[PDB]
Design a protein around this ligand. Structure first.
Ligand SMILES: [Cl-]
Ligand SMILES: [Mn+2]
Ligand code: NA
Ligand code: NA
Lengths: 257, 256, 255, 253
């Protein structure tokens, strides 16, 4: 099942969509700077693109640490991004009250992994009728995603994306199970599946070589999109050039059975 | 480091405290009946006892399964439990705004595992000055607990309990790392460590609960955290007799 | 199922048996010294005792790998003469089995080798009591598969030895629920706990906590290593505490 | 580092090599039949191929499962496979004393995962001077493979292949860490790394094997290893991906 997000077709047999931007909104200008860069690279490579940012940092290094620009200011910034660039955007929500107002502005709203089992937040997101991205918890098996899908469905919203992030592997480590993508497709009605390679990397080319190998491996399984929380060199375009080459090949192969 | 909860001394070298009760407050009369049974059995054996329930169950099986009685009625039930039985009570909080009204009533407030890294909530909990139970997420290593403890300390609250609930072991399964209790003690200032046997799990379930509880308590812990209907309620006395035996043995010998 | 090993009764509802000794045999004199200590401590504590050592470290690097086989057996012969106790050692090759078995009362299947069907059969054939080291990669519900091979090869005197489970990379965890699973699915054969190898990744403190936790689940035995590994001088104090707990658990009816 | 196996070049920047065949050797006629199938499909696609079988499999699922035709007849069968098809062959050994006579015939000799730490076998295998396939145990971290490599090096043989088989993931399940390949390359001197997709496992089974193989090969590997129409369609897909990947240079650093 494909999902239309404006002029973008997101699905598991469509050209991959890049979800990318920044961790936590800080200022208007450094936001537009970052998004202009993604847009420029994705445009020239021909890759559909959705800008990502949070307005709030939920887990902070200190009780005193910077927290982000918050909802009201956050939403202002998003509104600007859409105006300037004419692209979709995606952000996470943490509170049911937040859902409708965020959804007025943000094309896709995201269920944080830690909140994935919070029924209140599920219901309130569903009710917006917006496209929803479900961050698969590291502690949840691919087989359980169907249970989250069922709740959203029951709550009246079937416009759901499933987003791989890795799985708990002993203490403080993650592993990505490449078979999980297929399990999710098969059990969740072939909803779009996307791969958050960045957050999968708990833990040649160093880290850049790692991200590349892992991103290539996941996209080889035929996925709707790739989700980056970040990555004189042009590191982004080098990366994407290779992802696009593999994705174009994969998506040109007929599906078996 | 010990914590006083009314007339109870909670600590890793003290007689174990039972944190026991039910999942979700759904009723008054039934809650009181269940509590009565825990009270009678624990009093009979001289085990210190804190009644546990949630008024607002976060992760429901379905979108419309009953979430519980809610904050206002829930606190009223806790008030009745405290008045009737003279025991402390423990409940979880999900939002900063809930912290004050819950803490005014409840002796221990609980940080759910899924919110354990939600700074806003941590700070709001700290600031109540209440005794706090920190539920360890299944995906967090024991060495990471110190980071939560630090955040509480920064925010002015040192009355903290760490609660073990197992660790993710491949898909779906949980394992309890018996070594983790010690790592928590050694890195978190020998704060009270308690073991949630019920949520660490998943004569079948009963025989597993007993083996697992005994194994945990053999490591020298402050308390044991369980839920009944979940242990069958009528077998509570037998279960506790066995836990007490082991706890009394272990605690009676000095640390080696 | 209980298993008689000379005058020792080994079983999950019997007083725990200590399987103790050292990583590897290096000399006669050091072996007899370490054994002497184990025997005197266990005798006064009233704990049944089986001496453990390997004659070969088959997975090291390459010079000690130990005094090797021919010499090893010599030393085991001495140990048995002097102290009148049973002994246990591991075999890594099928041909080793029968000659090792003439001397050593319990023979051990190494964890890495549990799927080696020629070794299983050769071990089984000896008719000796067998200690099966549970592989780090094998679930407790699959121990039954190794048991079945031994049964089908005509030996039912099997001990199941927990040694921890793979947990991510380079770490182990001991699943305290595993003991019960093994009991229920493997016909209540003696289950023992290798606390030493489980600890692979203070030590004195973590070993005691881990050993107490396992024995709390009602086991036939404890399997451990010292060096002059628990510090040897601590063995008596360590064992006092293990016995204390074992005695309590074993006094409590099942169910 | 590349390894030459007769006319084949095996290496992480070379077209992938297929390792495949039968579980255990039964008979000459049986072996030739199966081998011819692999040969026809691989030749038709231009994929280098090495025939795999055991002559004495020591880790089968029952005690009385057939272990194969044995050393003497096995080696006679391997000789005939080599002569008939002009391809290399690979077989496992589990006893030190087997190594020399096996190495007379078999181009590649394979260290079973369960013996990977067994020094005596490692030394006896090394001393053959043959190409060696090291099966990575499911309990061994990818950064530990360097220790095995070192033991082979000490014993005088560096013609080593590393074979991924997956990693213990809780109980029973195996997961393949796609990052482990890179770790092995980095720490083991860019020795050829191959992927045993079949073991790694336990649409259907087929759809899975496809996804998992494609994922591994996307990381740039010397070969694909298969345990116990269809083979053609699979290999077409692997080759497409492999050709694409291998034809691009490594990241600019
Ligand atoms: Cl760039
Ligand atoms: Mn040892
Ligand atoms: Na209070
Ligand atoms: Na593992």
């Amino acid at each position: 099942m494909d999902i239309k997000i404006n002029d973008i077709t997101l699905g598991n047999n469509s050209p991959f969509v890049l979800f990318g931007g920044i961790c936590v909104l800080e200022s208007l200008d450094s936001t537009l700077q970052t998004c202009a860069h993604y847009v420029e690279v994705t445009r020239k490579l021909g890759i559909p693109y959705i800008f990502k940012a949070s307005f709030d940092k939920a887990n902070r290094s200190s009780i005193h640490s910077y927290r982000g620009v918050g909802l009201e200011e956050g939403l202002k910034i998003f509104e600007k991004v859409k105006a300037e660039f004419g692209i979709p955007v995606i952000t996470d929500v943490h509170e049911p009250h937040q859902c409708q107002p965020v959804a007025e502005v943000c094309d896709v709203i995201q269920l944080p992994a830690f909140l994935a089992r919070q029924t209140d937040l599920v219901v309130a997101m569903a009710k917006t009728g917006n496209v929803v991205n479900i961050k698969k918890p590291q502690f949840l098996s691919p087989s359980q995603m169907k249970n989250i899908v069922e709740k959203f469905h029951e709550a009246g919203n079937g416009k759901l994306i499933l987003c791989e992030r890795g799985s708990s592997f002993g203490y403080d480590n993650l592993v990505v199970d490449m078979l999980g993508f297929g399990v999710m497709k098969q059990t969740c009605g072939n909803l779009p599946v996307i791969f958050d390679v960045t957050h999968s990397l708990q833990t040649s080319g160093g880290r850049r070589a790692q991200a590349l190998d892992l991103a290539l491996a996941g996209m080889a399984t035929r996925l709707a999109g790739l989700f980056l929380e970040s990555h004189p060199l042009h590191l982004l375009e080098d990366f994407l050039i290779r992802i696009k080459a593999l994705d174009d090949l994969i998506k040109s192969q007929p599906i078996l059975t």
